[PDB]
From a paper:
The S trimer glycoprotein is responsible for binding to the ACE2 receptor and for viral cell entry after cleavage at the S1/S2 junction and S2´ sites. Receptor binding destabilizes S, allowing S2´ cleavage, leading to shedding of S1 while S2 reorganizes to mediate fusion of viral and cellular membranes, enabling entry of SARS-CoV-2 into the host cells. The furin cleavage site is a four amino acid motif located on a solvent-exposed flexible loop of S7. The BriSΔ variant, originally identified as a viral subpopulation from SARS-CoV-2 isolate hCoV-19/England/02/2020, comprises in the spike an eight amino-acid deletion encompassing a furin recognition motif and S1/S2 cleavage site.
We determined the BriSΔ structure without applying symmetry (C1) at 3.0 Å resolution. In our analysis, all BriSΔ particles exhibited the locked conformation of the S trimer we had described previously. In the BriSΔ C1 structure, we identified virtually identical tube-shaped densities in all three RBD domains, indicating high occupancy of all three pockets. Using masked 3D classification, we scrutinized the data set for potential heterogeneity in LA binding and found that at least 95% of the RBDs were LA-bound in our structure. Our HILIC-MS-MS analysis provides unambiguous, complementary evidence that the small molecule is indeed LA. Importantly, BriSΔ lacks 8 amino acids including the furin cleavage site and the S1/S2 cleavage site located on a flexible loop. This loop is now shorter due to the deletion and thus more rigid, as evidenced by density in the C1 map which allowed to build a poly-alanine chain. The deletion site itself shows smaller conformational rearrangements in BriSΔ when compared to WT S, confirming a more rigid arrangement of the shortened loop which in WT S comprises the furin cleavage and S1/S2 cleavage sites. A decreased stability of open BriSΔ trimer likely derives from the more rigid loop (T676-Q690) lacking 8 amino acids including two protease cleavage sites. The cryo-EM structure of BriSΔ evidenced exclusively particles in the locked conformation in which RBM binding to ACE2 is obstructed.
Author numbering:
A (entry chain C): 945 to 990
B (entry chain A): 27 to 67, 81 to 141, 157 to 174, 188 to 210, 215 to 243, 262 to 618, 632 to 678, 687 to 828, ...
C (entry chain B): 746 to 828, 832 to 940, 945 to 1039
D (entry chain C): 296 to 344
The structure:
Amino acid sequence: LGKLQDVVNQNAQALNTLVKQLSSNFGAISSVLNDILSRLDKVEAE
Amino acid sequence: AYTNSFTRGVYYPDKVFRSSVLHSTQDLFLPFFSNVTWFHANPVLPFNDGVYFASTEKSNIIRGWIFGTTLDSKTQSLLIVNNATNVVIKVCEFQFCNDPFLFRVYSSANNCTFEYVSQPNLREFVFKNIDGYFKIYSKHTPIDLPQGFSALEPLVDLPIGINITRFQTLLAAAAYYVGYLQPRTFLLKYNENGTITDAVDCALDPLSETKCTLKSFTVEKGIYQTSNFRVQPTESIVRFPNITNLCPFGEVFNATRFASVYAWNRKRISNCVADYSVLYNSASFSTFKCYGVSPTKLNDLCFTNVYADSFVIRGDEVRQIAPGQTGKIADYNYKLPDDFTGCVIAWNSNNLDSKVGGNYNYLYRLFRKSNLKPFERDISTEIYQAGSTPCNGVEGFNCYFPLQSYGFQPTNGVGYQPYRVVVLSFELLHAPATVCGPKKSTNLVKNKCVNFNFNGLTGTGVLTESNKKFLPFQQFGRDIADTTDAVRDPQTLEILDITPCSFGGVSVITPGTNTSNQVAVLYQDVNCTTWRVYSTGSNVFQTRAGCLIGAEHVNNSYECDIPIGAGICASYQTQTIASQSIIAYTMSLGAENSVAYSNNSIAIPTNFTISVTTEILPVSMTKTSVDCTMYICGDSTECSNLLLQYGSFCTQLNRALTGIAVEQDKNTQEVFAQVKQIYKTPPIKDFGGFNFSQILPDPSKPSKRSFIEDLLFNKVTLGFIKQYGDCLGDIAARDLICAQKFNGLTVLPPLLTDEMIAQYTSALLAGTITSGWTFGAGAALQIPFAMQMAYRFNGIGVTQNVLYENQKLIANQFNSAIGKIQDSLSSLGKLQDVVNQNAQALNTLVKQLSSNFGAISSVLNDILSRLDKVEAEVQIDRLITGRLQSLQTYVTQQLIRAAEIRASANLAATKMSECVLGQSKRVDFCGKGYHLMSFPQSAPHGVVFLHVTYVPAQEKNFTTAPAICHDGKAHFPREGVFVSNGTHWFVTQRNFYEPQIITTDNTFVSGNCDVVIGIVNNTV
Amino acid sequence: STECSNLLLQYGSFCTQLNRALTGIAVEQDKNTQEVFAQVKQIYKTPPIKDFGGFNFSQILPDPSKPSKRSFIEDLLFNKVTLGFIKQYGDCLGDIAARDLICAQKFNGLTVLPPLLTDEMIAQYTSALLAGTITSGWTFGAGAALQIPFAMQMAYRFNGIGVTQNVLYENQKLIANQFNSAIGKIQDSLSSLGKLQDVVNQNAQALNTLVKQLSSNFGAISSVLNDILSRLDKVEAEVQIDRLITGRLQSLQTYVTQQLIRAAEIRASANLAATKMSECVLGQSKR
Amino acid sequence: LSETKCTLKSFTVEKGIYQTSNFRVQPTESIVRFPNITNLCPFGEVFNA
Ligand SMILES: CCCCC/C=C\C/C=C\CCCCCCCC(=O)O
Ligand SMILES: *[C@@H]1O[C@H](CO)[C@@H](O)[C@H](O)[C@H]1NC(C)=O
Ligand SMILES: *[C@@H]1O[C@H](CO)[C@@H](O)[C@H](O)[C@H]1NC(C)=O
Ligand SMILES: *[C@@H]1O[C@H](CO)[C@@H](O)[C@H](O)[C@H]1NC(C)=O
Ligand SMILES: *[C@@H]1O[C@H](CO)[C@@H](O)[C@H](O)[C@H]1NC(C)=O
Ligand SMILES: *[C@@H]1O[C@H](CO)[C@@H](O)[C@H](O)[C@H]1NC(C)=O
Ligand SMILES: *[C@@H]1O[C@H](CO)[C@@H](O)[C@H](O)[C@H]1NC(C)=O
Ligand SMILES: *[C@@H]1O[C@H](CO)[C@@H](O)[C@H](O)[C@H]1NC(C)=O
Ligand SMILES: *[C@@H]1O[C@H](CO)[C@@H](O)[C@H](O)[C@H]1NC(C)=O
Ligand SMILES: *[C@@H]1O[C@H](CO)[C@@H](O)[C@H](O)[C@H]1NC(C)=O
Ligand SMILES: *[C@@H]1O[C@H](CO)[C@@H](O)[C@H](O)[C@H]1NC(C)=O
Ligand SMILES: *[C@@H]1O[C@H](CO)[C@@H](O)[C@H](O)[C@H]1NC(C)=O
Ligand SMILES: *[C@@H]1O[C@H](CO)[C@@H](O)[C@H](O)[C@H]1NC(C)=O
């Protein structure tokens, strides 16, 4: 039943990588909006 | 005297070596096929953007040139003259003559700076004047202007720094030419040595744009899409409100006494003209910064809500007048919004505000409970509580007077001297304005594409009367796309409509550059029944897909050659009375033939033919892998470290690529490894007189392939071991294969080799020739080939004695049919297209590494050789983002292709199972006709099916009846039909004429002979 | 904008790719139509004398008294779907462009190409198929068309499903009446195709969202190139124009990817239709 | 094997074949090649006239 199990595994893997990809910086100074907004004013945070 | 330059005037745009490449550049080039002016045996001509000067000479008559604006002693001029002994270059204030010649050129040389002297058959020169540099390119070539192509080389770049608008030649028989240069795009070609030997002028013709797009000098037969029809603007328009007065610069920047910072002032500015040049001789400003606009754009704008605030502060507090500052002034006195749009101006005023012994008339606030809001004022005078101890007016040790005083003395340090500050705020391009700049209006032009500037808003388009009613407080009008569509004229107050002046698609039909150089153009949004075209012609054909211009209409109908659209195709005549041309016609649907129907007539075949047809199906595509770090960062440790902030984006790509790679092997497996028993070819070749030698394995080759397989494997042009030293050095500069894998792009081999695939195919053939379809359902059982063919004939509705009586005819027909296929295979596009696509996808990925993506360069080493860590972290990230997007696009397209290839592979597997391991009843699934058998052959990345079918031929006409009434009962054939030749009645079969006597054995009676329609009589 | 045109050259290899994909799709569509309809290259004329055992085909055969040669049911079908046109520059110049919604698309570079086969040609193919199958049976799909009376063909077809032919020759009249009534019921029902309408709806929506997405800022100070260039000099305006270029290129890429994904499904449906034609119309099916 | 473990972000690996990074080689030394010039630029003339 590997043919059926593969679909479930693929869906779970996709949804888990989506969550894991929230810790990237993408070139910013931090990956946490709260940290960014606790230290910089509006113009520098935009 | 006009003349045509053809391809003269091409120079090297850079100083960098290139070879075996095609390069697209943009610079000031002399347009291809442009008319130059001819001078024989000395006027003053304009110098517009550069000049291409050429001289056919034999005795050194042309000596030099002079450049300038006016050639008298009121301006500076450049002299480049070649006297008999020297070449002298001077940039002075010359006084020249009407007719200078050699040496009497000028009279006085008053003052000047630049000087270079000493420097102890067809000539071409190019001149330019950019950023204060005079550049020259030149070349000499030994043998009115000739054909050919030559590229000029850089000579000198003089820093003269003057203004040039006219030039003149110096003469001492000969002739010279003069052509101007314009900013165009050109596609150059470097040969093996790095010399330029060809070029293409994009946007000179309709076929020249296609060449630039494809990045090739050749084009194949077809129809291509070009850019939409473009229209350039004719003239310019400026429309400001008509105002006369000048803004109150004196009252603001020149007042006698200024306000205090805590009680700052504010006055409105309206109905004036902003011209700040009047301040250039009275006031100097130490600080001047603007925020939502550029300082160089203030002259061309209009402003909506202008205010001016003024106060006095000490010297070192000027840095606190900015949007995001903190401190004593920004907290309790004056604050700017974070979205500020305006300018801030400050200057020293120690002469007007400083009195000896201390000036105490300027105050500020030092204590306050909380911070101020933007543009808020607080002029209170309440005592301030700072210790929780109450105090109702009394003062001391806990309660203070909020306001403090400045002490301004004339001998203070510059940090403690008074400064006057003015802040201007306004809005741009949203509402009606009454303060404009120093610009002069022009007339209003309608119904033409022109440039405009309406209250500072610039653009292009066509103006038109409008039927909208703006409210008094509105000035502009937008749409869903958020662009300005209507505007109210600021003088007449009428409303206009702005429309883009570019519209309509264009296409070009070409027969092939290897054949001809003429084309036809289709204007898809024009009705010629003429105007929105690049060129009219003698013949102009109007279709329902557009207006075709350049083809000759004909009234015959042929099959489609180049589909144009809406039922019309085009083709090259060539072979005709006229030299050659293009023709346009309507495609034909296949020569309507006939129908001969009646209620008592039938046709029955009397013969047959054996036909063999070929079918091709793709089964696999190439497998690849990617090293993301090596593609994005190369060998840079800095980039490698910066890339970790995108860590989860490379495993994601590699997983999909690995999935595709492992799917390919399953695709091949399901198609070819159906029978896991390997049957060897029989040792004696005797199958009822049928010849299979051209499809059975041949052991007289390095492999065991058959003749047809060997023919197939040579019609598609292509694992391997490419060693590092194999393409070390220059060889990597042209390989095109290890150029890929120097960047991290590899190709993985297939799991099953072509030898194994051929072994599987041979097993299939041996099984199906020796056993029939039994080996596909279980244990293989032997059966003679003639009897197997009898079975297969019984499977299509024909008796077996028909085969046993025409065995030799059938065998001969089959042998000839098999020979014809290998005859035709002499000189597979469906299989070749897969290889072409897989190669192009990988080559574009390498090509896309030369983009900037908005940075200053596409070379990490160049970026890192000039900038430090912080300044390079901003430029590297743009390249990282762009190069990640490229790989993502490649992977998505690969997935979308793999899905289609899998669909094809599944179809091929079903076809094998149903046509090769059995006989099929589905119509048109295993060929055209009645399917008898089929044989598989292997091709590169695909399979080939040879289908044998039965086709009837040579029909004859017969009369027929539905039933026969013998003696009051109704008789039915029970198999086949009743036919009559005119006097006698017989019963035969549907697919072959074979009459018999009507009797009870081949008949059944289930009627009374009263109701059947069409019953005859005769007898049985 | 010439400035934007010059700044866009640093993404030159991203437009040819999109155009290549779109051209592939557009070429595939004509092949889809051909494989389904142009199966037979011999056009058969409608019989001059209409005598088929009492069967009435008048509602599905070509009608020669219409501006085209479409049949009654075909016209009913064509009236139920609400969509090769020439739209001229002078046609929608002015305020009309603010509501047309068709030349608002093509003021921004988005155009639609006509199909290669017209509706009249497709109907001619269908008429040829009908005439062939009614006058020859299934022999014309295998070779030369051999004529046969319709009643005898129908007896063949009854034998094809295990019923003797006398069962047809003794109930011909009732069978013809039933067939005529059943045919009438279909045109009765076709009075007042959601599978076919969705294709048009999806394509139009995809084209309209592309035009709508041109008001996004993408992080810049404004979504208007003229507004950006009327206030900032080159150095300050390059920074803003780059963000707009990035966002709009991304929009185009998303549109193209969705178009490819839809083309795959349309191709699967077309392959099913071609196989169904071959097996159900040119023969008799046992599946 | 360690590179595979790091890529899979797991301390165990299942039976199979896995792709690792391309073959890498590090540089052995450093090189500098500027033109041979002796004179010193004229700072006095420009900044001290
Ligand atoms: C010696 C004490 C060190 C201070 C503790 C560290 C950080 C405190 C927060 C900010 C630094 C104080 C800066 C004061 C100078 C600016 C004063 C002003 O013009 O507003
Ligand atoms: C130009 O020459 C005149 C001589 O008449 C001289 O007075 C003037 O100073 C010169 N200008 C410069 C910039 O040297
Ligand atoms: C250009 O290079 C080829 C080999 O690459 C060489 O044979 C030829 O001589 C070169 N051309 C010149 C002008 O030297
Ligand atoms: C400012 O005032 C001084 C003295 O009153 C005067 O000389 C100067 O011209 C004035 N400047 C302007 C721009 O009015
Ligand atoms: C406005 O007044 C209220 C009530 O006195 C006060 O609480 C608030 O702080 C004031 N706003 C500012 C910006 O000081
Ligand atoms: C072009 O205009 C003419 C004039 O009205 C019209 O008859 C013709 O149909 C138009 N062309 C098309 C393709 O409709
Ligand atoms: C049937 O066709 C074959 C090949 O064309 C021919 O040799 C043979 O004579 C034909 N049979 C008759 C009865 O004509
Ligand atoms: C089969 O064909 C091959 C090639 O045409 C030929 O050499 C061979 O002799 C043929 N078979 C027989 C039995 O002749
Ligand atoms: C059968 O008769 C019809 C009607 O005359 C004719 O068109 C057809 O050609 C005939 N068949 C053959 C094989 O000649
Ligand atoms: C065919 O129709 C004609 C016309 O009425 C008729 O005379 C003839 O008997 C019919 N033949 C059959 C077999 O029904
Ligand atoms: C068949 O024969 C009967 C007499 O047995 C005759 O009455 C009848 O008319 C014949 N059929 C036709 C159509 O004439
Ligand atoms: C066939 O249908 C048409 C239209 O409904 C009708 O006019 C005709 O009468 C029908 N056939 C017969 C034989 O009545
Ligand atoms: C510049 O000239 C002064 C005056 O002689 C001298 O003291 C100084 O050293 C000179 N500059 C340098 C860099 O030596």
